Design an enzyme around this catalytic site. Structure first.
Site, mmCIF file in Angstrom:
data_model
loop_
_atom_site.group_PDB
_atom_site.id
_atom_site.type_symbol
_atom_site.label_atom_id
_atom_site.label_comp_id
_atom_site.label_asym_id
_atom_site.label_seq_id
_atom_site.Cartn_x
_atom_site.Cartn_y
_atom_site.Cartn_z
ATOM 1 N N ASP A 1 -4.966 -6.669 -9.026
ATOM 2 C CA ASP A 1 -4.445 -5.430 -9.585
ATOM 3 C C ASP A 1 -3.723 -5.679 -10.894
ATOM 4 O OD1 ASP A 1 -5.399 -3.550 -7.881
ATOM 5 O OD2 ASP A 1 -3.577 -3.366 -6.693
ATOM 6 N N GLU B 1 0.816 -1.205 0.000
ATOM 7 C CA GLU B 1 0.000 0.000 0.000
ATOM 8 C C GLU B 1 0.852 1.258 0.000
ATOM 9 O OE1 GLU B 1 -2.870 -1.054 -0.619
ATOM 10 O OE2 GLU B 1 -3.234 1.029 -1.203
#
Lengths: 28, 141, 33, 174, 89, 101, 61, 163, 196, 84, 209, 52
Positions: free
Chosen positions: D113, D33
């Site tokens: 992703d 992240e």
């Protein structure tokens, strides 16, 4: 001596060069 | 020196190949291979006599000898009876009976389940490009 | 420095700091649950 | 989670999902992240970050909340700069995890992703004609459903080779 | 309805795509052999423990293969026995 | 569920997991099976294995003459074929031990 | 992302520019010939394999 | 285009007032029905060019590709296929006659609907030149091409679009 | 007769589970160097997803050890019968009549009673490894390009939908003759027939 | 779920919609598929985003394998499946 | 009279004789219930085995049992080849060939009994919703894996054929007696074929276990 | 000059004959019959024209 029941083996293939280019493009 | 007439050739062939007037329907290559096998099936009498006996039992004429001879001499048959030195071999795996040991496996299925002679005779009837066919059989190319 | 010049995906991608490959394990059972 | 499947949530107690989320598996989500938010911050004209979170609701991923502007592209416009920026931002997490925790200890956490980035590169080539050698022609079709397949194509193999080469080099640049 | 994705039949047999089956298969085979070899190497140094535990398990009781017509986990006596055998041998 | 007395169990096991079986004459097989069976059946509540650092770490549980340093990790009974006459090695010697307290 | 990519030798591109069969390991079943199992740099077999295991291994060439 | 061959109509009214479902609009002046019974070659070429114009104008003004192209090529590609296979205007083979073509089917087969709309500007008005198939036991469908013929046919489509 | 067959069967059955539990106990309570614990041995799909997507390679190797302990234990304890079957009596490997009787016993596989694997163990192993390869794109990320995208290999080029969507009956009418051709030329009506 | 499909303008030529409406639908569809992944209330239990379908297939099904090298089959080792 | 020609009766009888002989001398096989050649002049031949409810399918299949079944299936074709010659072999022994090949593929690709493929699972039997009772689940293999598996399948089948030939050649007198009994009587039951085989010196295969 | 495209057109020019500019076509397909006939007639044409 003689044979053994557990000998290694192999498979023979002959690939062209365009094929090796293709498989090395998607190996990344 | 061996003497062979029409009848023995006809009988040996009809045992080994089948009907004898279909050489065109099956191609000349199949016929040449079958001719090689038949020629090898002659040239020693222990097999020629058995072939003639099988033929004459199948046709079932007056001289049908009630059965063909067995493939094994009555000596090896005793050497494998329960009172024999080879009875135990009837109990081994199917790995002790194999008649072929190959350590390099070829990319083609024709080379696995065919003999070298058969391949060199039959490889022209395959559905592959010429560069592929030129890679099978004797490396002479 | 300029280590980011010598990044090469053929011989493996790696950063400057020394390989924090620390780890541990209990049994497979005490790790599933 | 909907059947015998599962495998994403991480705090229920049962065999699939551990209770306290091991710390080695939390460092990795933090790295993921951090990389993704850093890349989204240094890219000009990207959306703006409102909140960055680690394992919300105990799921084994991160989460970044992006707020955008609806008076700039009014639910209909998509330039090329935006698409390339999005591809880069979606691959950032994988790259950061690989750079920090070594190339062998990466996880499957960034596997959706990745597929998103690929998907963009597909549309840019086979559906909007932003490809150089492929040019402006439409290739894909949506298979009517209700092995799962979403698209469908009937282009020859010699054009499929070229199209996929272009997709791959887009992904490599990103 | 024929097949239209022929790609190679010169030194192999390939169709369009597939690129990803050699990598997959070699990985699978390698990993399975490594696991089996580690298991063998561990059990190879603990043969006496195996003989002893087997003797005990036989004399306790087991479900014969033909008596049962219509063991995922261990009972409690067998757990006492396994723990002790691991402590001794 | 069926059970069996200890004598029948140690008769079913036999020369259980010795690594050098398949090479042992049937008489030695019978005798080893019986003796170890009596040990495992009579002394079973106190029979332990001898401490491992005294014999089993020096590599004395399986000894081979064609590999006196254990660079094959104790698989020399399977990796190295028997030397022929006159070669360096004839005749090969193999030993296997088991020690209990 | 124009100008970025990977070079064919592996490097990033910014926008502008034999086994040792010495000891006992050399006395194994075929030990040097073409039928020998693939080894490591120190003489051990590939995955810790041994001619005992119940499955064969594949030669590289 | 109207001032080089004379086939296209005249523009009537341009608007960017969001109204209904669209955000922008461009209306043309329809001709008499005699105009829309046939579909010659030049008229179809002009229809293709008009399909591409919007996205290419946005790209040449803004300086950058968008998803506007996405809505053009789709339409264009459809028409281009009809130009090559069904009608046979191209040069695929020496004449324009290919071994395969996909004739439309009537809209009776669909599970239809009903709305209070007029006929679409062109795409439903230029559908007057088709003659779909109606009875099922007289439908012709040649054997599909062979992915080496399909290569050359799709290449003809590409050549038309690029020109 | 039945005595010896029962001996072989029972020995195999017992050694299987002995080895399985020995490896379970070892891995759980001894590799870790509070309370003795045991495993439950069942791999869900949830568990397979977790293990393959978030754990390293060594964890998966431990799980596989747990799966194959029983077979390896059976292996380490079986009598090779070739020795006695060729001793008590004496192109095929049983044709060689020389080779000192020890070097003769390696010409083919040993005669072990319990050969082969159980199918549940194989299913579990291969599913675990296939998930690790196909869902966790490490070392090869470019193989995602052919993901949920078909390439129209064996079929008619352009076909319209069918009655559930379109009330058109031509594709089904052709499919029926396709099936006739299959039954009459390729397969037959039961497994084992040359044709219909 | 109470009861889009482009197969009407391919094979049946219906084409009962104005060009600007079709264009608008296409614009909104591409933007929705690409940029509404993981956005609250706008990108949700929606079947128009391919990434949601990828995720469900990644956590629910078992690994799918590639096509085969056999002939007389469709792409995988199977025959054509029923039309109705 | 006899509607059926001689040579057809000979061929079918030799086939059934070979198959029944080898199903008799094989350890742990089912017991023959009937052997008939063209009953009621209906062109057909078969060899029924007695069906029992004692067989529990939960019990596993050893390797020895599977190989025995493979040999029993190749028996009839081998008998034809041995007595009448290759050029007279027909295609009547096709279902046996199918079942032999099925067993040989399942031993290699579904039970990991091949030393070269390993313990990898590539086939899965499955039962239909109740034609046939079963079908299979397959896996897409590459050319390397498929060739390595085909080599082993071929080795297994060749060895099975050789063992069948030997098991027939060492029982030539019992084979002759049985085929003559079939050629003159047309139909036999299990007890009678057992007696015919015993009164002629039949040689059973050993059982090492 | 910026108003040009680089849309690749495969069967353009010299690529209008059997390989059609596909590099791998001769490793996948046997050569058809009509292609051999075309090669034969083209070869005889351009090989008697040096005499013509």
């Amino acid at each position: 001596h003689g044979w053994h029941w557990n000998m290694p083996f192999s498979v023979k293939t002959e690939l062209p060069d365009w094929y090796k280019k293709e498989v090395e493009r998607y190996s990344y | 020196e061996l003497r062979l007439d029409d009848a023995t050739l006809a009988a040996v062939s009809r045992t080994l190949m089948g009907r004898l007037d279909v050489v065109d329907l099956i191609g000349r290559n199949t016929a040449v291979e079958a001719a090689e096998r038949v020629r090898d099936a002659l040239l020693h009498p222990e097999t020629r006599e058995r072939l003639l006996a099988m033929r004459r039992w199948v046709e079932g004429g007056p001289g049908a000898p009630e059965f063909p001879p067995s493939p094994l001499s009555p000596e090896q048959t005793a050497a494998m009876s329960p009172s024999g030195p080879l009875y135990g071999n009837l109990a081994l795996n199917l790995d002790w009976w194999r008649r072929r040991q190959d350590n390099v496996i070829s990319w083609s299925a024709m080379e696995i389940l065919m003999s070298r002679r058969q391949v060199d005779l039959y490889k022209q009837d395959a559905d592959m490009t010429e560069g592929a066919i030129a890679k099978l059989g004797p490396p002479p190319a | 420095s300029n280590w980011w010049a010598s990044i090469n995906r053929k011989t493996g991608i790696r950063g400057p700091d020394p390989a924090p490959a620390e780890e541990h394990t209990n049994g497979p059972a005490r790790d599933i649950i | 989670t909907a059947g015998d499947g599962g495998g994403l949530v991480g705090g229920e107690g049962v065999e699939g999902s551990p209770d306290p989320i091991p710390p080695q598996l939390r460092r990795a989500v933090s790295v993921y992240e951090a990389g993704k938010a850093l890349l989204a911050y240094i890219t000009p004209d990207y959306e703006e970050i409102a909140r960055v979170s680690v394992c919300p609701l105990n799921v084994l991923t991160g989460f970044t909340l992006f707020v955008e502007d609806e008076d700039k592209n009014v639910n209909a416009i998509l330039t090329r700069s935006e698409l390339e920026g999005r591809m880069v931002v979606h691959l950032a997490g994988r790259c950061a995890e690989k750079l920090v925790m070594g190339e062998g200890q990466m996880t499957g956490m960034g596997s959706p992703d990745l597929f998103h980035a690929n998907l963009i590169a597909r549309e840019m080539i086979m559906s909007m004609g932003m490809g150089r050698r492929t040019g402006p022609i439409d290739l894909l079709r949506v298979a009517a459903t209700s092995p799962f397949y979403y698209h469908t194509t009937d282009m020859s193999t010699e054009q499929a080779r070229v199209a996929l080469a272009e997709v791959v080099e887009l992904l490599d640049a990103a | 309805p024929k097949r239209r994705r022929w790609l190679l039949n010169n030194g192999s047999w390939n169709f369009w795509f597939n690129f990803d089956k050699l990598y997959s298969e070699e990985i699978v085979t390698t990993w399975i052999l490594e696991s089996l070899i580690q298991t063998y190497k561990y059990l190879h140094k603990n043969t006496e423990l195996l003989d002893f535990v087997t003797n005990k398990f036989i004399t306790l009781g087991y479900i014969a293969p033909e008596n049962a017509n219509l063991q995922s986990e261990l009972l409690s006596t067998k757990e006492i026995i396994l723990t002790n055998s691991f402590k001794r041998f | 569920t069926e059970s069996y007395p200890a004598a029948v169990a140690n008769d079913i096991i036999g020369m259980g997991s010795w690594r050098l079986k398949d090479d042992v004459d049937p008489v030695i097989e019978f005798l080893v099976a019986r003796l170890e069976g009596c040990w495992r059946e009579i002394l079973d509540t106190d029979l332990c294995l001898y401490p491992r650092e005294k014999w089993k770490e020096q590599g004395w549980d399986l000894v081979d003459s064609m590999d006196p340093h254990q660079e094959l990790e104790g698989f020399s009974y399977a990796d190295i074929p028997d030397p022929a006459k006159g070669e360096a090695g004839y005749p090969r010697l193999q030993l296997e031990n088991r020690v209990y307290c | 992302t124009t100008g970025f990519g990977w070079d064919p030798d592996g490097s990033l591109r910014y926008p502008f520019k034999t086994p040792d069969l010495s000891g006992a390991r050399g006395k194994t079943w075929f030990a040097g010939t073409a039928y020998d199992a693939p080894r490591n740099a120190d003489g051990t077999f590939k995955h810790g394999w041994h001619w005992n295991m119940p499955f064969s291994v594949k030669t590289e060439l | 285009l109207r001032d080089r061959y004379g086939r296209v109509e005249l523009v009537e009214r341009v608007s960017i007032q969001p109204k209904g479902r669209a955000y922008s609009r461009t209306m043309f002046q329809r001709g008499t029905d005699e105009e829309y019974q046939l579909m010659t070659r030049g008229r179809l070429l002009d229809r293709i060019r008009l399909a591409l114009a919007g996205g290419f104008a946005v790209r040449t003004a803004l300086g950058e590709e968008t998803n506007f192209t996405a809505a053009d090529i789709k339409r264009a590609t459809r028409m281009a296929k009809k130009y090559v296979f069904y009608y046979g205007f191209s040069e695929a083979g020496g004449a324009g006659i290919t071994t395969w073509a996909n004739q439309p089917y009537s809209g009776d087969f669909v599970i239809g609907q009903q709305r209070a709309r007029k006929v679409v500007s062109t795409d439903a008005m230029d559908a007057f030149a088709d003659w779909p198939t109606v009875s099922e036991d007289f439908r012709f469908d040649a054997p599909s091409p062979s992915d080496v013929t399909w290569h050359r046919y799709t290449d003809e489509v590409r050549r038309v679009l690029k020109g | 007769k039945k005595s010896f067959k029962k001996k072989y069967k029972d020995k195999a059955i017992i050694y299987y589970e002995v080895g399985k539990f020995v490896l379970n106990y070892f891995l759980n309570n001894q590799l870790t160097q509070d309370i003795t614990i045991f495993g439950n041995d069942f791999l869900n799909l949830k568990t397979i997803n977790y293990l393959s997507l978030y754990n390293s390679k060594n964890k998966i190797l431990l799980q596989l050890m747990l799966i194959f302990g029983g077979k390896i234990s059976q292996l380490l304890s079986s009598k090779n019968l070739v020795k006695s079957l060729k001793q008590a009596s004496i192109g095929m490997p049983l044709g060689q009549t020389h080779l000192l009787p020890k070097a003769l016993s390696v010409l083919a596989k040993p005669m072990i009673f319990s050969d082969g694997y159980n199918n549940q163990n194989l299913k579990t192993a291969t599913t675990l490894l296939l998930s690790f390869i196909h869902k966790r794109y490490l070392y090869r990320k470019n193989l995602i390009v052919p993901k949920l995208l078909s390439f129209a290999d064996g079929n008619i080029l352009d076909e319209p939908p069918s009655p559930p969507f379109s009330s058109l009956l031509i594709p089904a009418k052709r499919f029926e003759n396709y099936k006739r051709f299959f039954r009459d030329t390729l397969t037959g009506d039961k497994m084992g027939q040359r044709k219909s | 779920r109470r009861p889009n499909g482009s197969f009407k303008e391919d094979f049946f030529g219906s084409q009962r919609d104005e060009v600007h409406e079709k264009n608008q639908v296409v614009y909104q569809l591409t933007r929705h598929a690409i940029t509404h992944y993981k956005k609250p209330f706008k990108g949700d239990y929606s079947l128009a985003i391919p990434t949601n379908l990828y995720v469900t297939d990644l956590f629910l099904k078992l690994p799918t394998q590639s096509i085969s090298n056999l002939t007389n089959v469709e792409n995988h080792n199977l025959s054509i499946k029923n039309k109705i | 009279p006899d509607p059926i020609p001689p040579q057809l009766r000979r061929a079918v009888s030799v086939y059934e004789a070979g198959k029944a002989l080898l199903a008799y001398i094989t350890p742990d096989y089912e017991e023959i219930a009937r052997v008939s050649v063209c009953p009621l002049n209906v062109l057909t031949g078969f060899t029924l085995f007695v069906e029992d409810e004692d067989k529990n399918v939960n019990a596993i299949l050893t390797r020895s049992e599977l190989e025995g079944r493979m040999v029993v299936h190749l028996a009839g074709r081998c008998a034809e080849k041995l007595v009448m010659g290759e050029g007279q072999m027909t295609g009547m022994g096709s279902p046996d060939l199918f079942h032999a090949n099925l067993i040989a593929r399942e031993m290699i690709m579904s039970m990991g009994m091949g030393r070269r493929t390993g313990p990898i699972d590539l086939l899965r039997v499955a039962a239909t919703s109740e034609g046939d009772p079963f079908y299979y689940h397959t896996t897409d293999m590459s050319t390397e894996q498929a060739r390595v598996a085909l080599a082993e399948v071929v080795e297994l089948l060749d060895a099975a054929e050789a063992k069948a030939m030997y098991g027939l050649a060492i029982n030539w007198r019992a084979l002759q007696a049985l085929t003559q009994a079939l050629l003159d009587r047309g139909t036999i039951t299990g007890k009678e074929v057992a007696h015919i085989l015993e009164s002629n010196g039949v040689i059973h295969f050993p059982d090492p276990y | 000059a910026a108003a040009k495209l680089d849309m690749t057109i495969f069967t353009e020019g010299a690529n209008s004959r059997w390989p059609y500019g596909i590099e791998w076509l001769d490793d996948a397909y046997p050569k058809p019959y009509w292609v051999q006939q075309q090669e034969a007639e083209a070869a005889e044409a351009q090989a008697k024209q040096p005499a013509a």
